[PDB]
Structures are given as C-alpha cells and as structure tokens.
Write a protein that binds this ligand. Structure first.
Ligand SMILES: Nc1ncnc2c1ncn2[C@@H]1O[C@H](COP(=O)(O)OP(=O)(O)O)[C@@H](O)[C@H]1O
Ligand SMILES: [Mg+2]
Lengths: 154, 783
C-alpha cells in the first residue's frame, strides 16, 4: 500500500513506537497483542475486528509471542487512517437513546454497564468500571449525550 | 397481578400475564436472521435455528433437536420475543401461517383462550371451565373500548351494545366454527351479557301475554327448549346444535330490552330416524325415556328402554356429560316459562312418542305379490291413537296411496321409506312451530328501535363425504365471508381516503363472487337442481350430465371430482374461498323435492289432535334449495343493515383434551374460517401504518442526518427525507396526513436494518470507549 505520511511524521510514529517497546534488548519490536494500544495512542479509534483484520487473522498464541518491527507496522497504520466511518455524534447518541425507556434524556446505570459488556464487541468488567469513573446521578441515572461528549474528548 | 388487571379479580391471569411474567418468559436468545419456521409433515410447521445456506437450500436445527434441509422459499421468519402471546395479531411484524398458529397456541398453553386478529375475536376451546365469565368480569368490561382491556367475548358484547347506543344503528355478532369449537358456549355468554346489562323497558302486561317472569328470563329459557329438539350427541360434540340460528335481540330507546326473534336453518331431519354408530338422536327422546316424569311414558304408551325403538337406538343411547333426567326437568320448565300450555306441551310429547312407534311398525310382502301389507298392528295402533288418526286408514294409506283416482302399489322398501319421510316432516314442522311459538312470547310493549343479531352457524368445513346439505352450508359461508371481505374493504377504503393514499383495488368481496354466481345465478348449480326437479323422468345421472354440459368448460370454479382411494364416491368439485370440495350428487333431486305420501298427509290434515292438523293445514306437494335461497337472502338483508362483529371458534383437538393442540387441525380451521383470508385481502393494501412522530422516534438511528437534531421540525418532511435516503424500494410505502403507509414485509426490513445499525453503533461506542481507556493509561505513562 502507498504511504501518504510526511518524513517528519514517520519519525513522530517511530518515537511513539519506542515507548511501547518493553524489551530490555531494545530491538524496537512489539507483540501482535499490544499492536492496538499503539494505534489508539496515535489518535485513532479502531474496533477489535479491524485490529485482528490488519494482522492477517492472528492466533491467541501469536498475539502474546509473535513480535513485529516498525517497517511492517507502518502499512497497517496507513489502512486504519484511511477509515472515515467512525460514527457521528448523532449516531452515538441515537444508539444510547434506544435504552432510554422513559424518553427523558437519561439511561439507568446498571443497564449501560450490561449493554457495553454484552452487546457488540464486549468490554471487560474492569473496562466497564474504569469507563464509569465520573459516575452517575443520586439515583443513577446517567446523562447520555453528555456521556458522548465525555468519551469523544477523553 | 399488575394494577391495570386488579379490576378483573380471579380472571386476571386467564386474560393477561403480568409485566414481570412477560419479560421473564420473553428473555431468550433471538437472532432475527437464524430463528425461523420450517415446514413439518406431522406438525405443519416447527421453530428452527439456521446453520448453513448452501445452494438454494437452508440447513437448520429444529426444536426437538432434529437437523433438516429445506428450500429457501419454504423458510419463514419468526416474530421477535417482544411479540410473544400478543393480544391483537394484526400488530405482528410477520403475519404468515406459523406466526398466527404459534401466537394462538402459545396463549392457549397459558390458558388465555381469547385473541384478536384485526377485526376477528378468535377463541380456542379450553375443555375446562376458567373463572373468566363471572359478574366481577362483567363489571370490569363495562364501557371499555377493545384496546382498553385484554381480549374477551364480553368486549364484543359490550362494544356492540355501546356502538348501538352511540352510532344509533343495528349490530350483528357472527359466531362460526366447527362442531365442538364453542359456538353455543359463546352465543349463550353474549345473550346472558345483554340480559345482565340491558335497560329495563315497559313491563306492563299485554292482552295475549304468556310466560313466566321477565323478557330477560324468557330469552334465556329459549335455549333449553330449542336444545331438546334441535341438539344431539355427535362424535365431535355431546351437545351439538343440528341447526343454524340467528337471534335478533330488539332494543327500544336507550338500550331498553324490547323483544327477541329466532330464525332457524337447515335442521338435520335425517337424525330423527337415523344415527351413525357413535351418535344419538335428538336429546328429547332420551329425556322422555329417563322416566323422570313417569306420567309421560303412560301418555305416549312407551317403555323406558331406548332399544325398544328402532329410530333412536341405532348408535348410542347414553352420554357421559348428559344427565337426561335433569335435562327433561329443564326442558319442561323452559316451555312453562315460555308460556306453552299443557295442551301444547303434551301434544309435542305425544307427537314425539308417535315418531318412536312409527319406526316400530313392521311390514311384509303379500304372498305371490310385490305389494306390502302390515306385519302386526300394535305399534300402528299406538301411533294413530297419539296422532289422532284411524289405525286402518293410516296403514291403508301407507300401503295403497291414491295418486293423480289411481291407487298406487307399494313394496316393503317403499312403505319403510315413506313412513320415515313422514316422521321427519312431522318433527321438522313441530320444531318450526315451537320457534314460531317462542317468538310470540318474546314480546313487550316497548317499541322496537335497534337490534343486535347473534348468528350461530357451522363454519366452512371440508368432510370426506360432501353431499347437498354441505353445499347449502358451504354456500351460506361463501356469502358470509364475502360480507366480511366487503366490510374490511370499506374500512380500508375509508382509511386510505381519510389519510389521502391513492390506492386502487376491486372490493375484496368480488373475490368470492364467481363461486356464489356458480351456485345461485340462473342456470347455476341450484337453478339446474330446481330445473331437474320439475321433470319426473330425471335421475342423478341426468342432473350430473346437465351440470357438466353447463359448467365443465366456461366455469373455472367447477371441475371434475379429484377422487382418490380412501375418500368415497364424488361427482364434481367446487373451488370455494377456503379450498376445493368434492361433491357427491346421489339423492339431491329427492332431497330437494322432499316427496311425502300425500294420502297419509290428508289424514294428518283431518286429525283429532289440533297440533297435527295445524302443522299440515298449509301443506303443498309438487323446494329445499328455494327455501334456503330465500332464508339466506333474508339473513343477508338483516346483516347488511348492521355494524358486524366476528367471532371465530376453534376446536384444539379431536379428543376433548384440555390444553392440547393438534397443529394440522388448528391450521385447517384457520384456512377455512376467514382469519387467514382477512390477512390475504389486507396484504393487498398497506397492512402496516405508523404515525410520523412514532416513526421518527424509532427509525432516526437509520440516518440521523436526514432528521437533524432540533427543538422544532415538521415530522412528515423528516420521515420523507429518511426513507428516501435509504437503499430501499421507494414504491413499497406511501405518505399520509398523520401516518406512513407500508406494504407487507417492508417493516421486517426496516427492523433488520435497525438492529444491524444499533449493533454497529454500539461497536463504535465501545471502540471510542477503548480509546479513552488507552489514553488514560498513556496520560499516566507520560506523567
Ligand atoms: N369457553 C369455554 N369454556 C369451557 N368449556 C368450553 C368452552 N367452549 C366450549 N367448551 C366445552 O366444549 C363443549 C363444546 O362446545 P359448544 O359450544 O357446544 O360447541 P359448538 O356449538 O361449536 O358445537 C361445551 O359443551 C363445553 O363442554
Ligand atoms: Mg352446539
């Protein structure tokens, strides 16, 4: 694939790539599993399916053991950057609106915890708890649309 | 029991389940693309989960864990769990055969016997008395609209009564279904409901006023009287109505009960003298023989044994559910409440006893002759005594009838046939007289303003052997279905006009016209039978030949009998709305003519028993189809002056088993009763229709850009924008004044697209939520 990043930007990706290198040998090689965290730190938001798709469908043991260099990571970052369909603010609010039974503008705490952990690409019980850091109201009662502002600015 | 259900008391769970109970029963995994319906040889349809779709054939795992392979077209979609045990089936996303079957049988399993399907009130026989008909329930249905309470027959009764008062017009409640489906049970409940709630009119005693108590009492006492002479034990039902009935309940000003009148149809005369091995004759015979009123055995000169009487002991003689002794008490009581005199009551009993002795009179061939003569006279002596006739004149008249000065000759078969034909004519004329008599009592001074007509008649059913009687009832049901179809057509046309939808179609009633025209129009099936009856040289073959030469080519609905090894002899086949019926033409000319020995009839006219002479006073000889045509025109004219309401009774199984559903049997009934027919004709229009406001609230997730987020916006324009933007058939919907109109299936797609979008958006919310967790474990690494 054709690379469209400027030479000054290639070094900006190479400097971020080094921060993820946990090796004491400093070979500048990261596991197929930590690959996603690099792309997320680079201001991108890919799905777990898109993560496993660019790696050519890896196995569970390949994500923990198989290593990867910067020359092979770059054509994959080019593929994620070209994706424009990340979902508008309106799309995100509409999805949570389905779970607003009362039609007031607030979804119950326990419901949102269950939705994000069962529907779609499920989030871990710890990933759910860490996301609801800023908590809910006295009854809880989570103001969606305001929660969309929170997760798209963080 | 939820607060909305508190008014219903003990009835509440037999009418609607609690929200808690609903959500818990509805929580199950469901994939809108894997969970389907597949055909079945034994069960008609089964639920299944798809596995693979390789080469035009779908491979799936059914309930009962079996793996099957079926054609892609043969797979049907399930309605989501949201839709389980729904109250009105017109609201379902998918309205196909298994969608209707499963919603009804799932409610039935929960002991909820009433369901709506558009206009129809569907009821499945529970074979168990449920606490849903008490005064507490009557009180909970008063003044409520259909949607304001769960389905029930009391909703039909109360709304018919309310519509009558509000719209100032006549009403009808049309109750059909097979034998043992529940027509009698529901007809009785409807009539009792009106007696409980109708206003009280002018009760001051008229000059020739007969009867005990009130018009409410009398209307209700009409049923045990009619049941003794018109009801019998059959294989399908222990208390089967062998006649059709239309009761018009007249109301004066303000819902004041004024009068009532009953019209009866196609009484099974053949039963008087004949019974199938597993069936009884009319109840009255066994009621008398019970010896509960011993003075009656002495009066009819009869024994207490049904087996001593050849007309009534050919099949069964006793019924599990029937106490004939208690039943005689109730019958005799009904006649007294209805104002019948001692003379009238004793005359009916005497004429019933006379019929019994008639079947016992034996005949023998005269030596070296083909002429019959009496083989004993004792039973003919007992008959003539009761019928107020001369024994010898009766026996002479039977063996040697006078015809157009010429004294004819009769053999043993000819006399046996003629005494049976006479016994059946007396019985039928006495039943018709009794209905006329009951009608005379069901009167008050309160003037007639409106009526509610309750029709209880056998539904369209295809049997192994279908003769003239079947054509008559099938013809009635054709006309009745056309009345339903035209009513639905008018309702739809009124809705599209009001909402300004330029839909154009022929009356759904026109879809049954060709069959009706084949049966009733000049040179049709009835016209040919009537024409062949006028020629004495005619036979069943001359009639069969006429039907073929007149219709086997230019009449589509007419065709050759599709005879198969198993089913008996057929002569032609008819294409009715509910399927194809194979008719056998043997005896139709004789059935239609109903020939009677007119020498014995002249004796009946000159009888010393006033009743007997009254019944034959206006007898004429030289048709059944002509009378049926007249009575049906009269019924239709009455129905077309009313706002109709439709009740569909379904028999769940053939074994009187509570809670058990036989899928093929329930399916056959759905195909024949109008339920599936109503779905078909509505599918021609716009079956699904959503308000602009409600569409915007549910389908904005499909393209939120088309309906931008605002504090004030025009919903018609917004819905117009959203639908136009989607990769959809833009000819599968129309825009109304307050609602969007959809073709069948379009909504099944809009929901598939909605769940595909909601799953994609949650995935993107989760991927964006992963980004803030990644940036928080990076803002901690950097700092
Ligand atoms: N709603 C009902 N509740 C309880 N039992 C019923 C109900 N409907 C019918 N049955 C039972 O089934 C029998 C047959 O019903 P019936 O009304 O006589 O049928 P039909 O008139 O359609 O032949 C009844 O005598 C009764 O035992
Ligand atoms: Mg009955």
């Amino acid at each position: 694939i054709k690379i469209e990043f400027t030479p000054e930007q290639i070094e900006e990706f190479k400097e971020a790539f080094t921060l993820f290198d946990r090796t004491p040998k400093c070979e500048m090689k990261i596991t197929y599993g930590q690959c996603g965290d690099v792309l997320r730190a680079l201001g991108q938001n890919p799905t777990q399916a898109e993560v496993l798709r660019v790696l050519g469908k890896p196995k569970q043991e390949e994500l923990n053991s198989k290593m990867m260099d910067f020359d092979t990571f770059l054509p994959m970052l080019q593929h994620i950057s070209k994706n424009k369909d990340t979902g508008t603010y309106e799309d995100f609010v509409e999805g949570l609106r389905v779970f607003d039974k009362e039609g007031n503008g607030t979804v119950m705490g326990a419901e949102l915890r269950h939705v994000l952990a069962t529907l779609g690409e499920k989030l871990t019980e710890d990933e759910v708890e860490k996301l609801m850091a800023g908590q809910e109201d006295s009854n809880g009662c989570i103001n969606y649309e305001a929660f969309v502002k929170h997760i798209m600015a963080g | 029991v939820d607060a909305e259900m508190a008014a219903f008391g003990e009835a509440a769970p037999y009418l609607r389940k609690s929200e808690k109970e609903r959500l818990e029963a509805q929580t199950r995994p469901f994939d809108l693309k894997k969970d389907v319906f597949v055909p079945d040889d034994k069960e008609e349809f089964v639920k299944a989960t798809i596995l693979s779709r390789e080469g035009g054939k779908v491979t799936a795992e059914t309930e009962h864990g079996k793996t099957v392979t079926v054609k892609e077209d043969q797979v049907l979609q399930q309605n989501p769990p949201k839709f389980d045990k729904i109250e009105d089936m017109a609201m379902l996303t998918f309205l196909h055969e298994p969608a209707v079957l499963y919603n009804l049988k799932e409610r039935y399993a929960s002991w909820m016997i009433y369901t709506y399907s558009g206009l129809f009130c569907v009821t499945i026989n529970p074979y168990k008395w449920l606490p849903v008909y008490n005064a507490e329930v009557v009180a909970a249905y008063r003044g409520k609209k259909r949607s304001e309470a769960p389905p029930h027959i009391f909703s039909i009764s109360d709304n018919a009564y309310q519509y009558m008062l509000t719209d100032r017009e006549n009403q009808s409640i049309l109750i059909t279904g097979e034998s043992g489906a529940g027509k009698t049970v529901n007809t009785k409940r409807v009539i009792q409901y009106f007696a409980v709630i109708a206003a009280i009119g002018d009760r001051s005693k008229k000059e020739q006023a007969t009867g005990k108590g009130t018009l409410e009492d009398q209307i209700i006492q009409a049923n045990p009287a009619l049941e003794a002479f018109g009801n019998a034990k059959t294989v399908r039902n222990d208390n089967s109505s062998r006649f059709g009935k239309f009761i018009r309940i007249h109301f004066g000003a303000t819902g004041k009960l004024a009068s009532a009148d009953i019209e009866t149809y196609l009484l099974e005369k053949s039963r008087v003298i004949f019974q199938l091995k597993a069936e009884r004759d009319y109840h009255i015979f066994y009621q008398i023989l019970s010896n509960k009123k011993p003075e009656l055995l002495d009066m009819l000169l009869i024994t207490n044994n049904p087996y001593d009487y050849a007309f009534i002991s050919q099949g069964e003689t006793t019924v599990a559910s029937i106490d004939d002794a208690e039943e005689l008490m109730a019958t005799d009581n009904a006649f007294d409440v209805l104002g019948f005199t001692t003379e009238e009551k004793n005359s009916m009993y005497k004429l019933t006893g006379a019929i019994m002795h008639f079947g016992n009179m034996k005949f023998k061939l005269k030596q070296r002759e083909e002429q019959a003569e009496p083989d004993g006279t004792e039973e003919a002596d007992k008959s003539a005594y009761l019928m107020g006739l001369n024994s010898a004149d009766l026996l002479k008249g039977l063996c040697h009838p006078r015809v157009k000065y010429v004294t004819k000759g009769q053999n043993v078969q000819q006399v046996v046939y003629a005494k049976g034909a006479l016994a059946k004519a007396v019985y039928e004329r006495m039943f018709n007289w009794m209905v006329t008599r009951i009608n005379a009592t069901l009167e008050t001074k309160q003037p007639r303003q409106y009526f509610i007509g309750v029709l209880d008649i056998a539904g369209f059913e295809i049997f192994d052997f279908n003769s003239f009687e079947q054509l008559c009832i099938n013809f009635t049901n054709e006309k009745l279905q056309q009345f339903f179809n035209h009513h639905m057509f008018v309702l739809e046309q009124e809705e599209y006009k009001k909402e300004g939808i330029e839909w154009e179609f022929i009356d759904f009633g026109m879809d049954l016209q060709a069959c009706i025209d084949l049966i009733e129009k000049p040179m049709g099936i009835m016209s040919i039978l009537e024409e062949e009856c006028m020629f004495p040289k005619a036979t069943d073959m001359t009639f069969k030949a006429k039907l073929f030469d007149n219709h086997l080519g230019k009449s589509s609905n007419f065709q050759k009998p599709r005879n198969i090894k198993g089913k008996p002899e057929a002569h032609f086949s008819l294409i009715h709305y509910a399927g194809t019926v194979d008719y056998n033409i043997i005896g139709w000319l004789q059935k239609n003519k109903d020939p009677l020995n007119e020498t014995v009839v002249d004796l009946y006219k000159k009888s010393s028993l006033k009743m007997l002479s009254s019944l034959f006073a206006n007898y004429a000889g030289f048709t059944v189809s002509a009378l049926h045509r007249e009575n049906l025109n009269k019924l239709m004219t009455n129905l077309r002056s009313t706002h109709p309401h439709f009740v569909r009774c379904i028999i769940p199984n053939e074994t009187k088993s509570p809670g058990v559903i036989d899928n093929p049997l329930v399916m056959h009934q759905l195909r024949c009763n109008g339920v599936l027919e109503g779905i078909r004709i509505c599918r021609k229009g716009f079956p699904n229709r959503i308000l602009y406001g409600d569409f915007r609230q549910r389908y904005r997730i499909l393209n939120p850009a088309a309906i931008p987020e605002g504090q004030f916006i025009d919903s018609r324009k917004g819905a117009e924008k959203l639908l136009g933007s989607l990769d959809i058939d833009h000819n599968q919907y129309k825009f109304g004044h307050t609602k969007v109109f959809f073709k069948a299936g379009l909504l099944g797609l809009l929901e598939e697209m909605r769940d595909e979008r909601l799953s994609r958006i949650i995935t993107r919310i989760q991927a964006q939520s992963r980004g803030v967790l990644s940036r928080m474990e990076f803002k901690k690494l950097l700092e």
